From a paper:
[name] is a transmembrane receptor that is expressed on the surface of early hematopoietic progenitor cells and dendritic cells. Mature wild-type FL belongs to the structural family of short-chain four-helical bundle cytokines and consequently exhibits a noncovalently linked homodimeric structure, in which the two protomers interact head to head. The binding of a dimeric cytokine to an RTK-III induces receptor dimerization that results in transactivation of the auto-inhibited tyrosine kinase domains and the activation of downstream signaling pathways. However, structural studies have shown that the hematopoietic receptor [name], a class III RTK, does not appear to engage in such receptor–receptor contacts, despite its efficient dimerization by dimeric [name] (FL).
It was found that a Leu27Asp substitution at the dimer interface of the cytokine led to a stable monomeric cytokine (FLL27D) without abrogation of receptor binding. With only an excess of FLL27D detected, this shift indicates that despite its monomeric nature, FLL27D was still able to recruit all available receptor molecules into complex formation. The molecular species has a molecular mass of 70 kDa as determined by SEC-MALLS, which is well below that of an FL-mediated receptor complex (152 kDa) and therefore allowed us to infer that the apparent FLL27D–[name] complex consists of one molecule of FLL27D and one molecule of [name].
Author numbering:
A (entry chain B): -3 to 134
B (entry chain A): 4 to 134
The structure:
Amino acid sequence: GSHMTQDCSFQHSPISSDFAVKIRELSDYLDQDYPVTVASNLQDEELCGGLWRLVLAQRWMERLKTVAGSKMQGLLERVNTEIHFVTKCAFQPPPSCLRFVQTNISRLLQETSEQLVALKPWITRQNFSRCLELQCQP
Amino acid sequence: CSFQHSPISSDFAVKIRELSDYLDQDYPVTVASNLQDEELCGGLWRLVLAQRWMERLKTVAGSKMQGLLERVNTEIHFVTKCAFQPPPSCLRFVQTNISRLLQETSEQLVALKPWITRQNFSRCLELQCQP
């Protein structure tokens, strides 16, 4: 269920063993290299920073479902399912300090896979309420 | 980087407004956060960046938007005729919506329109950041 009023923590792992294969499959079969963004000045925390990058990536995945054709929906949703859990927490709006770089979906997917590798052993073990506010580097 | 005939038509603002108002689907875009505050070179720098977004949006917008997008592209495509250089590493960006990008674009064209056929703009080919 949702975690919108309570602590941002997970009793069952939302990240499956085969996230890397799912992400590599979408990246290999994409029909075009859609223009997206990544944050450029997030505070360099491994765990919170992974969640922050997944919050942003998850929004891109939903956006792409609205512009990619039929044939991409299953591949896109497979990646969405590995990262959709962040929507269950009350992440707050990004701060005005946040900066971005425009890049391509392939780079975003690579970054996403890297965050899941970092988060997977931790995801069900921690209270991540401390991460709901995105932070920038000075 | 100079123009013998004005590449900006009288009705740019109506064309941009039409795209903004009837945009069928929003898609995040970027604008620069720390460009040097030059009115004329700065307008050109913002249009170089906006014109690349117009081309990107054609690759994600549906059939019905292509005419609206191209009508704006034609108003700002003249920047592709100059040898603008790759942005410097200092340049940073914010994520925003197409409406904001379009309002910024219209504002640059109002500033540039009286100057565009008179001036040599070679001094603008390198984008500059604020201190």
